[model samples]
Target: IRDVPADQEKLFIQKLRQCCVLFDFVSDPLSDLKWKEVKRAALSEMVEYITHNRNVITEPIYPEVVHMFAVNMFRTLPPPTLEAAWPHLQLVYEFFLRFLESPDFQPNIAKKYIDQKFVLQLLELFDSEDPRERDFLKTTLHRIYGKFLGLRAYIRKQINNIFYRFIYETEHHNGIAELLEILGSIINGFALPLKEEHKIFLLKVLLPLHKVKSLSVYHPQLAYCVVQFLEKDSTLTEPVVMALLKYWPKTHSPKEVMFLNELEEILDVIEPSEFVKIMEPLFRQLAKCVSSPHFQVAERALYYWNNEYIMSLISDNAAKILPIMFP
Candidate 1:
């Protein structure tokens, strides 16, 4: 203490002493026997120390003490302290809310610490005899991990194993709605805006669901998202012949042609090997969908394969294009 600044150092020690007193009251095994004797002695000192610390930290010139105080409190608690768990959880949550609302903290830090491991630990506490912890967990989960993509690959298994199992085994009970909402939230965030490698990710994630026959629940949403993505792709100009040529030769239909345009656009941006393996099967589906007797469907099919549209839209391939046969 002598080496430290006289003014701030004493204040810091007094603050820590207060924290120790709080922990002792909650954690000491002898609290039962010694309650009457030590309670009055310690409580008075604890109150005085806390009151002084709060005045110093929360008053003028002090930055917000909530986060620092909460972090200290969280570190001091035993991880298994169920009696004190809710308060600790609340502190962590307020810290996270501050973290989320702050510009300095990115999603990655929360992903690294809170959501991946700590959040899962809180999950087990959800089924505890008391609902307070469960409620806190649910509300906090909604705030952070609700739309967080970081939790996708990890909690997806736990979700299916727990909540999804409840729905499946219960055969569409009241809880099924909540389960669907949870799964839907996961899928929506997972699929949206459509990253360059996102389709590949979906192709991996979706194929497993397809294998289990559970893909139908999310089928319409994913298919719709993909189609909109393909449509935007059809309108982009291709700068290279290799990009255009790869998409066109096998596309065979109008929708496929549009996808080929997207594929071409991306090829300019990434290696051919990154996307084409997934595109091949998807293009096959496009071909199959376009040929159905529906006029709206068939016209979409013909839009790319037809000479008139292709020649007008594409400048370099004008003379090379061939007209389509209606038969």
Candidate 2:
């Protein structure tokens, strides 16, 4: 197969399909013995052919190749089976990365076949407890989001909607943090001056994320995402501050304490003028934190004093803020 010339594209595709046949024999005891070698060879050739001969993936045979890999790697394997096939799963996702990276494989072409159903199917794989499995899922999906420029917002909306349903309807979601991590990258890439869609995502998707019972486990990541928005547009600072305050009572766990850290960053970036109207409530919340019997809460509130930028803003408003801080 190494000698196969670029001119022999037809035969090369045929050879690629031939390699896929090994997946069918995975259940066979003899084939199972040689599974690692067979899977590795198939993945290597498939990636090599698609990558080197980029035009070949646009051929009719390409969809079936992707479909075969997706089914075997994502859909067919249950948790234990996928755990057992972890090595092959890594290769499969790596092959997907190459497929998406191929210059000839336009993302729009993938849009036709890899629709919402296909995305949901891939997301289902996130239920695996294995960090290795989840990491591959994260990178591959992030690549998909990056490649399909047109699908960026749609994909974000879909993931947000799925989270809303799972969080509101179900008792638990093991994958929410992973999904949020993917969105963090997407959110990080949003165009500057912050569009209405970006604002909606902050208000609707991320702010509401604080209400999730398992939020603390992912707050650092989710906070990174929230701060990305504030950093992009200082105008976002007030609304974000207000939203965090609205959900403040809902946060009862130590993990939720990270919100104060995120809040401090937002405050550090806000102009003193923007702090004018919200100062009353903001200081009131700070006082609650400072007075809390729990050291964790009081300490986080005190940590804000160490921030010269934030302290200056508060000092600038001393006449108004002093009464609240002392009262």
Candidate 3:
């Protein structure tokens, strides 16, 4: 590219077209080692060019660049253990992100190609078993979500559908943690006086996420998203607490402890006035938690007293909470 003295868009497009080739990596990965190497070399060149060289505006070759992006990325990923092709895939991811972030790359033009179908294909790749693949997916999807304002609502809808399937049918998804990580920030930038749509997303999607079996995989990120909403609107505390108790783990001590930990966090941000509304039911759950046969669950419930906010919540409602605690 440095040799191409003048600003030549065609030469850049040529390099982009070269990377559009795909290989049958799954059938016999070893057989195509030579081509994979070439593909990777081409990809690294693209990444480097996008990073350093900006003379060639990305408008003309947008289709080719997008085609290359989809070709290399939207494929069936190999199992994590046998994912030998990740080296090449990693270069593709590198090029795509650099392309996305490039100053020369106009998102207004790119949106013509990076449309609904393209976004859906990207989401499907999230099921890949490799965490590295998902790590790349997270950054890429977040970048896409950030760039394409028009697709924001649809992107959220598709993600919500994924949860619906996971909660109702599959109960399996590897990228829940990554998805929640993106939503955590999205929820942060939400406008004041949140729409009913966003509120339903919190109540329907975020709240019920606590009960899924894969809670351990994504709970921290999930908790962060939940609390972001809480910090924004303290009024949501009642439904949030009641939902936790509704799905409260009964026989599962580990889940019970996890729930208790989340409960303490909610209490920290909870207003004492709102706490009064649900104190009776909340105390009942705490009493059960404190008496659990599992030592951790019992110990964790008592640990809540250590919180000044929770202690204050208890003291303010002592007349009501103490009887529930005692009886």
Candidate 4:
């Protein structure tokens, strides 16, 4: 509710006109210059708005209004790959940064507005009638939690529980795909400079998901899901594989150790076909990100293929076995 300058619109328009169009509107040379100025002004306003009008954001309209601000800024950016207009990207980041520092705003507010609704909307948005709209929506959601400070951290912590509940509760596998994608981003989003306490808290929150067999429910195709074989299904997954051998001890637990020898007895009779049959849905889910023509999903899919898969299946012996089994 802080008042912007009365002549602000006039000044903004004056600057807009001065920005030089380069090759085209998408590659406008002045876009960055305009963005630098626009971002500075918007950031100042955002900080002042949060500090001066704490109670104003408590209203029901707050989420929609804030979301609209984000959408409008997104609309202003030159579409991705144009390369010249990224200065505007800083504005959206400023919005998140100010939201985090504000005493009035908590991370939960972002979660309330931007959680499952946002993801599912984006899953649909990625399939949008307009490719640019789809890409912008997907990329924005992916980057929103980059710093994961204060309120954003709290919301990131809560996402696993929310997504987990929906995984089993939802009829279709779409929910699983959505959960996996968002969870991957959340795990990757926490800045390396994160506090030790926050890291410990995050580990505890993620422990349940780290259980090897738990992912078998989705039959994950990428390497991350497969690497659990070292600790749980050594015969099929080849525990000596890749980076997993280095982290094998991390999977041991008082509870799981008790069932360790017993797990083999249970696996003795299972067929590869049966394993593939059960894991089909998870593979299908992985494919949506990998095989799809959408660049965002494809890039993410390749990310898991390289990082997660390398961690999962990079054993010296795995290469021998996986190749022989490739049919």
After superposition, candidate 4 runs with Cα above 4 Å error: 1-40, 44-57, 73-83, 97-112, 115-117, 121-225, 228-327
Query: Model 2, which residues run further than 4 Å from truth?
Result: 1-15, 18-31, 45-61, 76-82, 108-111, 188-201, 231-236, 249-253
- Supply the global lDDT for candidate 4: 0.40
lDDT of 1: 0.40
In lDDT terms, how accurate is model 3?
0.83
- Once model 1 is optimally superposed onto the true structure by TM-score, how far is the C-alpha of residue 237 displaced, in angstroms? 37
* lDDT of each candidate versus the true structure: 0.40, 0.72, 0.83, 0.40
Residues 230-292, candidate 4: write the lDDT tens digits: 223334332222122222233323322212222222223333433333233333334333455
Tens-digit per-residue lDDT, 1-327, candidate 2: 333346755665565555454343345435555655765666777777677754566556667656766666655444223365555666677777787776776776777777666777877777777677788788878887877766666778777876777666774556677888897787778787677877987887788887776777677777878877876776777788898888886445464367688788777677666788688888888888887777798889898889998888888888988988875
- lDDT by residue (tens digit), candidate 1, 182-292: 445555565445564544433333222222233343434333433333344422212222233333434343343343444333433432333333344434443554565
Candidate 3 lowest-lDDT run of ten: 1-10
Clashes of each: 0, 0, 0, 6
Candidate 3 structure quality by residue, lDDT tens digits, 1-327: 222245577777777776777776667767767766776787777777679866565467788878987887787655445356678788888778887888776889999999999999999988888888889989999999999999998888888888888887865887899988988878888898988898998888889989877798898888888888999988898998889888898675767888888888888888878889888998898898888888988899999878988888788888888889876
RMSD of each: 14.3, 4.0, 2.5, 15.5
Q: How far is candidate 2 from the true structure (C-alpha RMSD, Å)?
A: 4.0
Pairs of residues clashing in candidate 1: none
Model 3 quality (TM-score): 0.91
Q: For model 1, where is the 10-residue window of minimal lDDT?
A: 318-327
